[PDB]
Amino acid sequence: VYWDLDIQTNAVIRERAPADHLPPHPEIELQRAQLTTKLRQHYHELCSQREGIEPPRESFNRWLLERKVVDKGLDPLLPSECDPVISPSMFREIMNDIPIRLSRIKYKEEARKLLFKYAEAAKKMIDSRNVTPESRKVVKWNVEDTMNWLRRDHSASKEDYMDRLENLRKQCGPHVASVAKDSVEGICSKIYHISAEYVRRIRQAHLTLLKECNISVDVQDRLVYCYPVRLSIPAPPQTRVELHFENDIACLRFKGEMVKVSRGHFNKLELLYRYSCIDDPRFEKFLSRVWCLIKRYQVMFGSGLQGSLPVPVFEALNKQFGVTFECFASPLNCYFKQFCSAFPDIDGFFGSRGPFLSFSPASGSFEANPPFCEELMDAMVTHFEDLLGRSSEPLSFIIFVPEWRDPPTPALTRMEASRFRRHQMTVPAFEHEYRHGTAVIFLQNNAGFAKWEPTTERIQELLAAYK
Ligand SMILES: C[n+]1cn([C@@H]2O[C@H](COP(=O)(O)OP(=O)(O)O)[C@@H](O)[C@H]2O)c2nc(N)[nH]c(=O)c21
Numbered sequence: 241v242y243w244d245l246d247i248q249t250n251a252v253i254r255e256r257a258p259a260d261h262l263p264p265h266p267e268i269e270l271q272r273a274q275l276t277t278k279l280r281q282h283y284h285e286l287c288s289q290r291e292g293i294e295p296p297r298e299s300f301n302r303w304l305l306e307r308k309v310v311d312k313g314l315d316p317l318l319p320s321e322c323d324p325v326i327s328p329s330m331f332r333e334i335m336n337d338i339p340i341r342l343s344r345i346k347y348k349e350e351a352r353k354l355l356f357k358y359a360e361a362a363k364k365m366i367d368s369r370n371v372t373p374e375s376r377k378v379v380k381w382n383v384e385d386t387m388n389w390l391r392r393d394h395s396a397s398k399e400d401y402m403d404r405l406e407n408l409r410k411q412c413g414p415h416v417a418s419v420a421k422d423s424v425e426g427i428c429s430k431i432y433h434i435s436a437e438y439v440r441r442i443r444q445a446h447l448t449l450l451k452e453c454n455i456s457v458d459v460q461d462r463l464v465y466c467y468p469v470r471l472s473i474p475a476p477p478q479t480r481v482e483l484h485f486e487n488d489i490a491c492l493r494f495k496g497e498m499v500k501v502s503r504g505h506f507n508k509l510e511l512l513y514r515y516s517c518i519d520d521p522r523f524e525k526f527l528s529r530v531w532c533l534i535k536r537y538q539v540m541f542g543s544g545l546q547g548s549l550p551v552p553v554f555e556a557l558n559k560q561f562g563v564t565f566e567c568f569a570s571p572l573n574c575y576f577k578q579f580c581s582a583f584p585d586i587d588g589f590f591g592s593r594g595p596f597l598s599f600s601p602a603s604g605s606f607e608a609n610p611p612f613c614e615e616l617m618d619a620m621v622t623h624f625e626d627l628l629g630r631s632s633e634p635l636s637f638i639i640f641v642p643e644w645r646d647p648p649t650p651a652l653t654r655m656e657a658s659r660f661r662r663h664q665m666t667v668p669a670f671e672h673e674y675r676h677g678t679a680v681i682f683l684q685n686n687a688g689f690a691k692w693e694p695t696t697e698r699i700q701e702l703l704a705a706y707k
């Protein structure tokens with residue numbers, strides 16, 4: 241019991257026309273996977289060649305999320321038409337690992353080595369690259385001073401080695417960043433432009449496949465309860481996908497390419513499909529779409545960027561606050577059968593109402609636990625407040641985000657200043673679920689505060705769901 245797919249939605253939206261996404265097909269999903277692998281390899285080579293570092297961990301996945309906040313292009317996963325070209329997310333993260341990535345340390349001798357590795361790398365940067373005479377002398381001085389200190393006979397403690405490195409980095413940081421800035425911007429641009437070329441190839445291959453199937457590629461303000469995203473383009477025929485089970489693992493094979501998912505999740509996807517898909521009454525296309533679904537989420541992750549809430553917390557949210565809907569989810573991790581997700585082209589067959597920024601409820605009770613992408617969280621807040629002020633009908637959002645204070649993130653700062661905030665608290669931090677600290681913000685309008693008020697009792701039952 242990791243989900244409850246019997247709960248009915250209370251989200252109300254304007255009736256919307258079916259979406260224009262090209263319907264998914266394993267041939268196209270496999271090509272997207274192969275090209276995304278190549279794109280990750282291009283990113284690895286650029287970081288190595290231009291800055292002598294590994295790609296910052298999780299930065300490519302966070303780049304996919306930031307780019308989709310502004311992407312206007314045609315791929316459901318890779319970006320291709322973004323303003324601005326340079327991602328502030330990828331830029332931030334690469335710069336933080338220049339001239340080296342600071343790693344975790346346990347031992348006095350590991351802190352000593354890291355302080356030395358940093359000083360050596362900063363020197364090599366100054367010796368080999370274009371730098372102003374002002375920046376050159378500041379770095380060179382700090383580096384020689386650190387080497388003179390390490391040259392002393394009597395040794396210091398682990399915390400002194402760590403403090404020394406912190407201070408050296410505060411001093412050299414700005415100078416090192418000015419030396420690498422144009423180079424790092426060039427990595428951000430180049431990987432964006434390679435992505436755009438891959439998107440164009442995938443798009444042409446997908447259009448050709450529909451033409452081969454003789455499939456052609458070319459509404460009210462009435463309120464309705466929400467429903468899954470529908471595609472206007474007819475889906476292509478099922479392809480041959482084979483299924484067998486192996487120690488409670490579902491194994492789906494398309495043309496020699498295997499994907500795996502647990503039996504429990506497979507059975508859940510079968511139920512979501514029954515509740516959500518309207519074009520496949522004999523399940524002819526079901527295994528083709530499950531194969532696409534698993535492959536797409538494997539490609540997205542590349543096999544630390546998001547948390548999940550315990551089941552009893554979702555139970556409390558539904559019982560105490562009438563929550564029926566997840567603003568950020570996937571068919572694999574959702575608790576409810578209605579949710580928003582990143583990939584409407586494939587997730588709609590399993591209950592997705594599409595990406596959250598494109599979803600406009602006039603009323604309902606919602607939970608939101610976004611991935612750890614600062615730009616997405618900030619757009620999420622802008623969207624919240626736009627919806628809360630466009631509707632007088634009961635509307636509530638209970639939001640879970642990490643308590644980032646050093647520095648604060650704009651989303652959390654803006655939510656705390658919101659005229660819609662009814663309550664805020666701190667709950668246990670996100671832990672790994674088997675299926676810092678967490679800020680919980682209640683944003684409601686007048687009618688939402690009236691219907692689902694955060695009273696003392698209801699707050700206690702929610703807190704009890706962790707205990
Ligand atoms: C700990 N932390 C993580 N982020 C975001 O997450 C990215 C990676 O942050 P990190 O500290 O390099 O990695 P970790 O969170 O996996 O330990 C940053 O570039 C920010 O976008 C953070 N963003 C802000 N504003 N404040 C924080 O304290 C903070």
Ligand SMILES: Nc1ncnc2c1ncn2[C@@H]1O[C@H](CSCC[C@H](N)C(=O)O)[C@@H](O)[C@H]1O
Pocket residue numbers: 305546547548549566567568569570573574575580581582594595596597607608609610611
């Ligand atoms: N634009 C978008 N709209 C909705 N969900 C998105 C999204 N971009 C990414 N996501 C999804 O947001 C989820 C965050 S993890 C949240 C897990 C669980 N549903 C919970 O609410 O606790 C991930 O599944 C991620 O893929």
